Structures are given as structure tokens and as C-alpha cells.
Tab-separated table of C-alpha atoms in Angstrom:
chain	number	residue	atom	x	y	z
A	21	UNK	CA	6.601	-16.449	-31.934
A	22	UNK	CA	4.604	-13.825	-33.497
A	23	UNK	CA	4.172	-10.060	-33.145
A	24	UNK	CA	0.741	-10.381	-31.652
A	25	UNK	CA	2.688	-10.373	-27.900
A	26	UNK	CA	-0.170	-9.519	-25.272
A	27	UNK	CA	0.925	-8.151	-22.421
A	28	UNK	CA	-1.457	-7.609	-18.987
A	29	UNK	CA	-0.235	-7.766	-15.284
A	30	UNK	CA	0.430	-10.866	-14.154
A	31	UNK	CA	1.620	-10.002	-10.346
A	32	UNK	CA	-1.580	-11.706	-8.734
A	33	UNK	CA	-0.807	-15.574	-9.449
A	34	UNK	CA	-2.313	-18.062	-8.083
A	35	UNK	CA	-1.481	-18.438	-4.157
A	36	UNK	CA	-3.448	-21.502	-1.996
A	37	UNK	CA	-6.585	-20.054	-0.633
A	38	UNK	CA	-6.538	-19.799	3.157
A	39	UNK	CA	-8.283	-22.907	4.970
A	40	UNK	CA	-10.818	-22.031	8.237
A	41	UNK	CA	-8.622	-23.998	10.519
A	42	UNK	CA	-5.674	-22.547	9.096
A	43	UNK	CA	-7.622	-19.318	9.925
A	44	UNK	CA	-8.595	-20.605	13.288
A	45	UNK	CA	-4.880	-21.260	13.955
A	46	UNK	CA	-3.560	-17.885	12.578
A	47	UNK	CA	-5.375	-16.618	15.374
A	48	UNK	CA	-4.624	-18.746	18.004
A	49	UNK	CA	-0.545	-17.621	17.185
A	50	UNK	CA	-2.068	-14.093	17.509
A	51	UNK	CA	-3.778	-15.142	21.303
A	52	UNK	CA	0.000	-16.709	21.535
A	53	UNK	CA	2.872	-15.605	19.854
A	54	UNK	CA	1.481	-11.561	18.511
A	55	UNK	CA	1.826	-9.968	15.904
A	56	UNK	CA	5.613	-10.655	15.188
A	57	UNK	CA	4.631	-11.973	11.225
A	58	UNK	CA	8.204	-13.054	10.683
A	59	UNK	CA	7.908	-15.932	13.492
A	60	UNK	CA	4.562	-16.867	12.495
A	61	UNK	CA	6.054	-17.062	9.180
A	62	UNK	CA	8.773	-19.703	10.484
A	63	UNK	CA	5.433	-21.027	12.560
A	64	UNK	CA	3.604	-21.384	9.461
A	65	UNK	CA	6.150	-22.488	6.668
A	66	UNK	CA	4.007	-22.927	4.244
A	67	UNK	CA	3.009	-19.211	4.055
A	68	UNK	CA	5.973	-16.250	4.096
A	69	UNK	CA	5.729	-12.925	6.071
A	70	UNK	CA	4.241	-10.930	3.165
A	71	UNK	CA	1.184	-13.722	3.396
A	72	UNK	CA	1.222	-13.378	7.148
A	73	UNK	CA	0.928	-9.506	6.217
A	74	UNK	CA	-1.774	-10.062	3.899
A	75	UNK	CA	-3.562	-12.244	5.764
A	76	UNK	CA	-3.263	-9.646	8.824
A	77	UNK	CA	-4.819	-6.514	6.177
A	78	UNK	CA	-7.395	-8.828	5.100
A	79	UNK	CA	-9.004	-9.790	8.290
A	80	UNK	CA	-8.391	-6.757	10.007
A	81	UNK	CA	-11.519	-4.859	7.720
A	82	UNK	CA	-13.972	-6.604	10.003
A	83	UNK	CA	-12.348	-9.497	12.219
A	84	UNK	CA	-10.646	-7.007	13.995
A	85	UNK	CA	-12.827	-7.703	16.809
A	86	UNK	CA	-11.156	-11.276	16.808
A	87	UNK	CA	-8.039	-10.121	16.541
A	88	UNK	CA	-8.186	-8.074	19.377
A	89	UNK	CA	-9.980	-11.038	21.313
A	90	UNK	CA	-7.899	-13.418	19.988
A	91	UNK	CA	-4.851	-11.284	21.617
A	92	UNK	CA	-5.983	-11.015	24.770
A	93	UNK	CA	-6.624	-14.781	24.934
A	94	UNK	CA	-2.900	-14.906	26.043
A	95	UNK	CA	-1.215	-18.758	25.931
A	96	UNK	CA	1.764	-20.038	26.964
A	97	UNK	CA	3.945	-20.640	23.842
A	98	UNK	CA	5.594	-23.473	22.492
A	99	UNK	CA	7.040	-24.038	18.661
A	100	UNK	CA	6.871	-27.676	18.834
A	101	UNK	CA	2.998	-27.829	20.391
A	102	UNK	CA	1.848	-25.167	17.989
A	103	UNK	CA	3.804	-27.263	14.430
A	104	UNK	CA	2.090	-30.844	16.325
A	105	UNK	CA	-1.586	-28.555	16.111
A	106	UNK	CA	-1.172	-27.581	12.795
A	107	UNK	CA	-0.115	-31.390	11.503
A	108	UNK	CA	-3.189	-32.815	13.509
A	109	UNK	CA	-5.413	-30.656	13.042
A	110	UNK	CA	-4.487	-30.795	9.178
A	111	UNK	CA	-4.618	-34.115	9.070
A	112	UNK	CA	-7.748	-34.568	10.776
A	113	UNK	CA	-9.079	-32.010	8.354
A	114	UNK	CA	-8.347	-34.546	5.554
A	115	UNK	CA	-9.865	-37.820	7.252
A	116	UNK	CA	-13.273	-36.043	7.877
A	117	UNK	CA	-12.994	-35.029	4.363
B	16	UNK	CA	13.186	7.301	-26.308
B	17	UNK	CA	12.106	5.232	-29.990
B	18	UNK	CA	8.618	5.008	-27.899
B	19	UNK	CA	8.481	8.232	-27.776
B	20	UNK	CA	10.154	9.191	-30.753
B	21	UNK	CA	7.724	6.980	-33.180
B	22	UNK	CA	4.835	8.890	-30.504
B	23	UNK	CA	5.931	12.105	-31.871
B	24	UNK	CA	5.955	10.939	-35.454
B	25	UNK	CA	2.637	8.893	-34.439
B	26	UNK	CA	3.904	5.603	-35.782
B	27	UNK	CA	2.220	3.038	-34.732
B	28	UNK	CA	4.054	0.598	-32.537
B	29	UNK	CA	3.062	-1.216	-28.939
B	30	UNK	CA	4.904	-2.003	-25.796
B	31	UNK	CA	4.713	-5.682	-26.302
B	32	UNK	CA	6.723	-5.708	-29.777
B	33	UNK	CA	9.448	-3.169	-28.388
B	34	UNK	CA	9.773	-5.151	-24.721
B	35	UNK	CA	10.321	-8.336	-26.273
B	36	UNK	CA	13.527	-7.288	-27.628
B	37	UNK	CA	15.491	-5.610	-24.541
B	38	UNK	CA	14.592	-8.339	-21.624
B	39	UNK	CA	12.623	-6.095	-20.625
B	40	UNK	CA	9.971	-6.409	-17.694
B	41	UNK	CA	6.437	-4.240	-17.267
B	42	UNK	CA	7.474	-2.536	-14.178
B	43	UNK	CA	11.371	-1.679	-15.062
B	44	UNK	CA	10.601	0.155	-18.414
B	45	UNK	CA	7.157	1.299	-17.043
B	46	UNK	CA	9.182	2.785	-14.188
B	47	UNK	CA	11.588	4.305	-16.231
B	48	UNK	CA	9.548	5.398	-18.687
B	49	UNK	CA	7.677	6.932	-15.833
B	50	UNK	CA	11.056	8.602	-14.480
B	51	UNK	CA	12.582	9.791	-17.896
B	52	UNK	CA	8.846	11.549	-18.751
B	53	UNK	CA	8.770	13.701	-15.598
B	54	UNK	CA	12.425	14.572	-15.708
B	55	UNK	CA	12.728	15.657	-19.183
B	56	UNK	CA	8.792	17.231	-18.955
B	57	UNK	CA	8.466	16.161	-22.724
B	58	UNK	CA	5.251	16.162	-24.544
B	59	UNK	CA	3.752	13.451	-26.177
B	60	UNK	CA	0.804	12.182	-28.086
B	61	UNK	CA	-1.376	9.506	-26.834
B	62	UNK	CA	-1.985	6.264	-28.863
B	63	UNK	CA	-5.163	6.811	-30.969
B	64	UNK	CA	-7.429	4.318	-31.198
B	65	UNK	CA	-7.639	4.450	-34.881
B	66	UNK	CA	-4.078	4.767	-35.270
B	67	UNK	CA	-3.332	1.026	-34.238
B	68	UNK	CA	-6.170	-0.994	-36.070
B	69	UNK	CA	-5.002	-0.026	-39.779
B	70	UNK	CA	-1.488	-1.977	-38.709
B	71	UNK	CA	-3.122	-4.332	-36.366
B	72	UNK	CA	-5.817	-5.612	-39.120
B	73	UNK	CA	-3.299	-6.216	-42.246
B	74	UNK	CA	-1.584	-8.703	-40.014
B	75	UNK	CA	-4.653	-11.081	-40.311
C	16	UNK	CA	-18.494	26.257	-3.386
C	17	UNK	CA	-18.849	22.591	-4.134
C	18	UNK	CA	-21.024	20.272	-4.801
C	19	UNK	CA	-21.844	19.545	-1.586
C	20	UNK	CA	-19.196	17.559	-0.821
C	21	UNK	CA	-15.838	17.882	1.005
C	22	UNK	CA	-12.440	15.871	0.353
C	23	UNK	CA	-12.267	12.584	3.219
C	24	UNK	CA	-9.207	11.372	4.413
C	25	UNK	CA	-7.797	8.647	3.978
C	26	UNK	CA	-4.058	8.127	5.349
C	27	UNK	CA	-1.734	10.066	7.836
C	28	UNK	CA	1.941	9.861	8.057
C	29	UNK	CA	4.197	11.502	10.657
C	30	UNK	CA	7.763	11.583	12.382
C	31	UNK	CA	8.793	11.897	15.640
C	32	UNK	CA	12.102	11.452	17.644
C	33	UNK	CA	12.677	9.028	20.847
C	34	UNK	CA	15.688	11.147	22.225
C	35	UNK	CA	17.737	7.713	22.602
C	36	UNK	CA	19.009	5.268	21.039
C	37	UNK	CA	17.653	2.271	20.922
C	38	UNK	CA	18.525	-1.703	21.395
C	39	UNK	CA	16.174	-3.361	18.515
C	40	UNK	CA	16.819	-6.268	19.345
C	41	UNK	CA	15.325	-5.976	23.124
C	42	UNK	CA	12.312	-4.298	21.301
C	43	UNK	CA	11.274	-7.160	19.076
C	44	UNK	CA	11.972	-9.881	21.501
C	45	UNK	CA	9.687	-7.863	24.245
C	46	UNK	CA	7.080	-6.172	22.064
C	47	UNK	CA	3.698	-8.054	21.470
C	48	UNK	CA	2.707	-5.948	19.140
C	49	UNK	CA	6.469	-6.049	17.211
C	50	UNK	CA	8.133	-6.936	14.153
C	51	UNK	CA	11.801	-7.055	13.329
C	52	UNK	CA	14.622	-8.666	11.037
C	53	UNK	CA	17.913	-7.566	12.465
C	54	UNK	CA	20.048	-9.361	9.520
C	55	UNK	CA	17.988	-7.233	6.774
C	56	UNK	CA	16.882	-4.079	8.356
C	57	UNK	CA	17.806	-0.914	10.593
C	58	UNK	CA	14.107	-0.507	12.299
C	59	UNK	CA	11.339	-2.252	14.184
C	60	UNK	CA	7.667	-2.833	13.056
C	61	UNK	CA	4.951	-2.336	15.791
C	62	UNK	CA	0.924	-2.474	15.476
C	63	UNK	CA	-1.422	-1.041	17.824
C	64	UNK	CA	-5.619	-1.447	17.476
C	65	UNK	CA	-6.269	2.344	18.387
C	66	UNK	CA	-5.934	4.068	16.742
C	67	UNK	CA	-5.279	1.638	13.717
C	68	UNK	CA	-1.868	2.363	12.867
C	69	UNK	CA	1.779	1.398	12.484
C	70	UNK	CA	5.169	2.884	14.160
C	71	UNK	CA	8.724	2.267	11.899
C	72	UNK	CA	11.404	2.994	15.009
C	73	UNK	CA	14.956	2.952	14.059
C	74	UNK	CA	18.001	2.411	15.917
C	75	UNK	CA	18.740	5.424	15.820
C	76	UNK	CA	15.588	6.993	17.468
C	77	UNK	CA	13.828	8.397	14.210
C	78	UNK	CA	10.444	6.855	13.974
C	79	UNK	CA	7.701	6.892	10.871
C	80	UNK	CA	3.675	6.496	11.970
C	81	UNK	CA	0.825	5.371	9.068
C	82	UNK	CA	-2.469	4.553	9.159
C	83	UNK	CA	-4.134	7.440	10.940
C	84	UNK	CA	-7.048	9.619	9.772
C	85	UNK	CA	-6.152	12.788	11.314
C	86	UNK	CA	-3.412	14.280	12.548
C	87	UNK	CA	-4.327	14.076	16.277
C	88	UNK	CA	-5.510	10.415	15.727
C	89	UNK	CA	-1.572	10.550	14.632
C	90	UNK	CA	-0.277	12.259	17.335
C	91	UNK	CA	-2.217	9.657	19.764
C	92	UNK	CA	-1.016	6.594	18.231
C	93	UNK	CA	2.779	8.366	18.391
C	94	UNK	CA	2.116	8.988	22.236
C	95	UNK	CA	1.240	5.407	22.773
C	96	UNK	CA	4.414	4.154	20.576
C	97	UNK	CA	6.415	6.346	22.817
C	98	UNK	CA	4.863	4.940	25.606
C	99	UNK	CA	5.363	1.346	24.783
C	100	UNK	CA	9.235	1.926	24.293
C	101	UNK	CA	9.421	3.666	27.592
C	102	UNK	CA	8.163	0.691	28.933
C	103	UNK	CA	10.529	-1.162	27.405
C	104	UNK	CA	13.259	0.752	29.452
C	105	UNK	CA	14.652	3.111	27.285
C	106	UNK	CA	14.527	6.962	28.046
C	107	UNK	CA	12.136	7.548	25.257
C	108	UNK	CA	10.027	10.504	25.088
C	109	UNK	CA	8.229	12.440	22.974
C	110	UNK	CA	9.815	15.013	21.326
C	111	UNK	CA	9.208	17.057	17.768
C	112	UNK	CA	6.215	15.306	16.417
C	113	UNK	CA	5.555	16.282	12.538
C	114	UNK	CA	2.887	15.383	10.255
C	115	UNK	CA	4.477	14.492	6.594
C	116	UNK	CA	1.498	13.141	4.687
C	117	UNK	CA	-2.010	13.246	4.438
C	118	UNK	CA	-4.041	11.558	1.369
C	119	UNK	CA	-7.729	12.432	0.811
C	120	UNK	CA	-10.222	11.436	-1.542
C	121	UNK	CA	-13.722	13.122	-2.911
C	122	UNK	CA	-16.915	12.075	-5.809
C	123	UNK	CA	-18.757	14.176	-7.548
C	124	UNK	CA	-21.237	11.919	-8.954
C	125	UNK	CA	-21.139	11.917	-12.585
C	126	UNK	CA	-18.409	10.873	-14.887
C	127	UNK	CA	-14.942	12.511	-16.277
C	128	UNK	CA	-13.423	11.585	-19.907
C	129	UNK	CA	-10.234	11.658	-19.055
C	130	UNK	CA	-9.321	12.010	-22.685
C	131	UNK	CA	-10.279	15.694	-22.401
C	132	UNK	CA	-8.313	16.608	-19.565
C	133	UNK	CA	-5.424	15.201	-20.753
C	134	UNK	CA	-5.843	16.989	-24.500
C	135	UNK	CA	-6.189	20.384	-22.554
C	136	UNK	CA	-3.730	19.664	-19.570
C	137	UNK	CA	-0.953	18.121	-20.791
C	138	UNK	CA	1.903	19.847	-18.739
C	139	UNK	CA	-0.136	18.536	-15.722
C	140	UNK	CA	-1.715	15.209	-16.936
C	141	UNK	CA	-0.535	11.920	-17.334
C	142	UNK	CA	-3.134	9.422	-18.978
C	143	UNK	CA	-1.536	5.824	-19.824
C	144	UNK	CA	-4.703	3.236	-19.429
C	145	UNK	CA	-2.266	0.662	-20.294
C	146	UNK	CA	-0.458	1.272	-17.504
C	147	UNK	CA	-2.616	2.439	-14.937
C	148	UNK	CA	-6.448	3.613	-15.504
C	149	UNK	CA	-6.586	6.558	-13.678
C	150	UNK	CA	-5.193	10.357	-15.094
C	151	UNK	CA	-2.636	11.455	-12.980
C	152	UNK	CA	-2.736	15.813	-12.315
C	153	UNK	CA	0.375	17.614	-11.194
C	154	UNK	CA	-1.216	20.514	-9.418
C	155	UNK	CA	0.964	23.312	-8.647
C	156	UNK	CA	-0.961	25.381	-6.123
C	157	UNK	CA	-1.333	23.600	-3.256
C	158	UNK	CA	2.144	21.311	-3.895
C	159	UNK	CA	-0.728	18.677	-4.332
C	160	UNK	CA	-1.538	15.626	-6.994
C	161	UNK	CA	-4.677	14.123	-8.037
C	162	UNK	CA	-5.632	10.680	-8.689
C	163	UNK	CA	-8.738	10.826	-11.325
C	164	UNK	CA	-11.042	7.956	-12.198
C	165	UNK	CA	-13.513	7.865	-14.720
C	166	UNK	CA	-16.244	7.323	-12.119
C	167	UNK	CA	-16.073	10.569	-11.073
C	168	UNK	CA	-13.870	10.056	-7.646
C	169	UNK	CA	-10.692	12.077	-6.940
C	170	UNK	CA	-7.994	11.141	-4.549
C	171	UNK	CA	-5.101	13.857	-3.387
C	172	UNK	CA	-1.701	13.055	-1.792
C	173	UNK	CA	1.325	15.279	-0.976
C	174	UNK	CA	-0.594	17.624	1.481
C	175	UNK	CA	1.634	18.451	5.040
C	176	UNK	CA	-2.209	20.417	6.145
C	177	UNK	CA	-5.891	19.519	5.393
C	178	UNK	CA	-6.508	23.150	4.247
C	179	UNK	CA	-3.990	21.894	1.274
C	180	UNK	CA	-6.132	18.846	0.450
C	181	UNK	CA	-9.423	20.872	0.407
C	182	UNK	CA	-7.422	23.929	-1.440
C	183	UNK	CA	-6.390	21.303	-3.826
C	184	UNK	CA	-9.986	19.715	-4.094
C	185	UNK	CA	-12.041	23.272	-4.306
C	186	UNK	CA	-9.000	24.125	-7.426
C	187	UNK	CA	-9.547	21.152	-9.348
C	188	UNK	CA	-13.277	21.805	-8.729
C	189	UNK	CA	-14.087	23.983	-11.772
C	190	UNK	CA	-11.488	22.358	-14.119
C	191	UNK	CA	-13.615	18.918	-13.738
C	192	UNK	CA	-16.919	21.036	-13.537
C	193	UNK	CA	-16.335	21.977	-17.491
């Protein structure tokens, strides 16, 4: 301890940067699910609704386009098909890597 | 209210060394110090830039 | 005048009132565009592309739009909330639209100590760097404040009318030209 405490704003830690396929997925639940953030939370356990929200802000400055394509690419939906995607596609993601 | 009391008598003190003390956290005092200031409308000084380094530099 | 420069705009908010009450529930299962955590919260969360904006509907038919530029770009984006709950089956409509907020922002290309405007507008100015950079101005006439940055650039919040941003913006204008 000493009296030399520095203090600065420590709010932005450090979260996992978003992957492309992750990205790629985010908006296929758009095309599928919408924009309901607290079930694409639950869809996407690793990230919370504020990171859904974030994520939704950030690409919406110039992928808005996509999101608006990616919306009107309308799919049937299914929890358990979407959670097998993510785990394959993941995984998959690792092997060519 | 020390803050701002040692502000009036331009003692030199810092955040850090008070908030260390009180369990304190940057956005609850900041926040309240935010609220108290614009509910009372009290003056106060600023910390001078000078004011600091004479206290800062004799703890080398 | 200025210098050749006017105030933009950046954010609108606004209320208006469905005229019914409302099942939240039905809304977020139905709603695309929808958001909503009945265990936590009283209102629903809905998007829409265009205009860019946001609708906060509660139960109890009070509603809350952001995001707009302009009022009527508010007023829209309220009309096509309205019409998405009326598709939803409720007896919505669109009743007593108000604008609340408007936030604007300006430059005037060379830099402001902020040290001096604090020294010689205390009872309005609020300087803590170590909190936030920016000076904070409590401006009386319009009921307006200003956001000041070192660069030079100006934001203002608090105005119900543009004429109170601009107001604001040509008041502050030969304070900051000194």
C-alpha cells in the first residue's frame, strides 16, 4: 500500500472480440429469430443481451444494409438446429485453423 | 464535504487517497459529488496544477 | 450572426399514448422487431430501420420514441409503432404525440481553454477533467445545457423546440467568441 493510489476508468475490460462466423451467425438469428436480443442472448450463451445490444449499435453504422437483408431472409426457426450450427461451425473453425 | 472543504482552504489532497478509505467506487462518490454540487450551488476552486506537485514531489 | 455555421441534430425523443391497454406479453412473442423481459420490466422494446429509431410501450399504453433527427422523422417512426400494435390487435391509435428532447451539436473551428470559462462562469460551469473532459454550461435562457470540448465543438440538450437549440447556440456564441 502506498498513497500513490492511481485511479482511471476501468469500465471497458477486456470482452472476447467477435469472430466472422460468429458474425455470420448473429445475422442469420436476425434472418431467423429478429431482433428479440434477450433470446439471441439464451441463443448465444456465451454473449449476454447488453453484447447482443452492442453488437446490434456497432454494425448498424454501416451493415445496416445486412441487417435489413439479413431480416428479410426469413427461416424457419429451431433452438436446437441453430446451438448444433454454432458448435459445428465453431468447431470446424478450429480444425481449419 | 472534506473535498470540498480542503478545496476551499486549497489543501492539497486527491480523490484516490480520500476513496480508499470509505469503500468507495468512481461512479457512487462521482455521482454524488455531482448531486450534492448542484443542489447546494456551492463554489469551489479547481485543483491547480502547481498546487499538487510541491506535495506530490516530497513523497519521492 | 455566426460563423457560418448552424447547430445539427443529433437525437429526438417523444411520447405518445396507445388509448389501450396493452397485453406485453402477446407483443413480444408476435413482434419481429420486439424486445421484452416480463419478470424484470413493465414495457416492450421494438426497432424499426426507418426511420432509425426505438419505441418503449408500456402496459399501460404510455410509449417513449429515440433515435430520430427531427421531430417529424419522430412523429413517422411513432405512426409506424402505432401501426405495428394495431396490427397486433389491440385498439391502438395515435393520440397526443409530444416531442420531449432534442440534442444538437455545432464547431467553430478553433479551440476553447476551458480554464477561462470556468474562472469567469462559475455559477454556470462545471470543469472536472478528472472526471469527464468536457466543461459542462448551465444556460438559463433557453432552459438549455452545453457540452464544451476543447476542440472547439459544442453539443446542447434539454431543448422541447429547435428554435431553443439554435437560441441556445447563437447565446453561447459571443461568450466562446471572447
Amino acid at each position: 500500500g502506498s498513497t500513490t493510489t492511481y485511479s482511471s476508468f476501468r469500465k471497458n475490460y477486456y470482452s472476447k472480440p467477435w469472430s466472422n462466423k460468429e458474425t455470420d451467425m448473429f445475422f442469420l438469428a436476425i434472418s431467423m429469430v429478429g431482433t428479440d436480443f434477450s433470446m439471441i442472448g439464451q441463443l448465444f450463451p456465451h454473449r449476454a443481451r447488453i453484447e447482443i445490444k452492442n453488437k446490434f449499435k456497432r454494425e448498424e453504422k454501416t451493415n445496416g444494409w445486412r441487417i435489413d437483408k439479413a431480416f428479410q431472409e426469413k427461416r424457419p426457426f429451431d433452438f436446437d438446429f441453430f446451438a448444433h450450427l454454432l458448435q459445428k461451425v465453431l468447431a470446424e473453425e478450429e480444425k481449419r485453423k | 464535504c472534506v473535498l470540498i472543504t480542503c478545496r476551499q482552504h486549497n489543501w492539497p489532497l486527491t480523490m484516490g487517497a480520500i476513496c480508499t478509505l470509505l469503500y468507495a467506487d468512481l461512479d457512487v462518490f462521482s455521482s454524488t459529488y455531482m448531486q450534492i454540487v448542484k443542489l447546494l450551488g456551492l463554489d469551489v476552486p479547481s485543483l491547480c496544477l502547481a498546487e499538487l506537485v510541491k506535495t506530490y514531489c516530497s513523497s519521492f | 450572426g455566426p460563423s457560418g455555421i448552424v447547430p445539427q441534430l443529433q437525437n429526438i425523443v417523444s411520447t405518445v399514448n396507445l388509448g389501450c391497454k396493452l397485453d406485453l406479453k402477446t407483443i413480444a412473442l408476435r413482434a419481429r422487431n420486439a424486445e421484452y423481459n416480463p419478470k424484470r420490466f413493465a414495457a416492450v422494446i421494438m426497432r424499426i430501420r426507418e426511420p432509425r429509431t426505438t419505441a418503449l410501450i408500456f402496459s399501460s399504453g404510455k410509449m417513449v420514441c429515440t433515435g430520430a433527427k427531427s421531430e417529424e422523422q419522430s412523429r413517422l417512426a411513432a405512426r409506424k409503432y402505432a401501426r405495428v400494435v394495431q396490427k397486433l390487435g389491440f385498439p391502438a391509435k395515435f393520440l397526443d404525440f409530444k416531442i420531449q428532447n432534442m440534442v444538437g451539436s455545432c464547431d467553430v473551428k478553433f479551440p476553447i481553454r476551458l480554464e477561462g470559462l470556468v474562472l469567469t462562469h462559475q455559477q454556470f460551469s462545471s470543469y472536472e477533467p478528472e472526471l469527464f473532459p468536457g466543461l459542462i454550461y448551465r444556460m438559463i435562457k433557453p432552459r438549455i445545457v452545453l457540452l464544451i470540448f476543447v476542440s472547439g465543438k459544442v453539443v446542447l440538450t434539454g431543448a422541447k423546440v429547435r428554435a431553443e437549440i439554435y437560441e441556445a447556440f447563437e447565446n453561447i456564441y459571443p461568450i466562446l467568441k471572447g
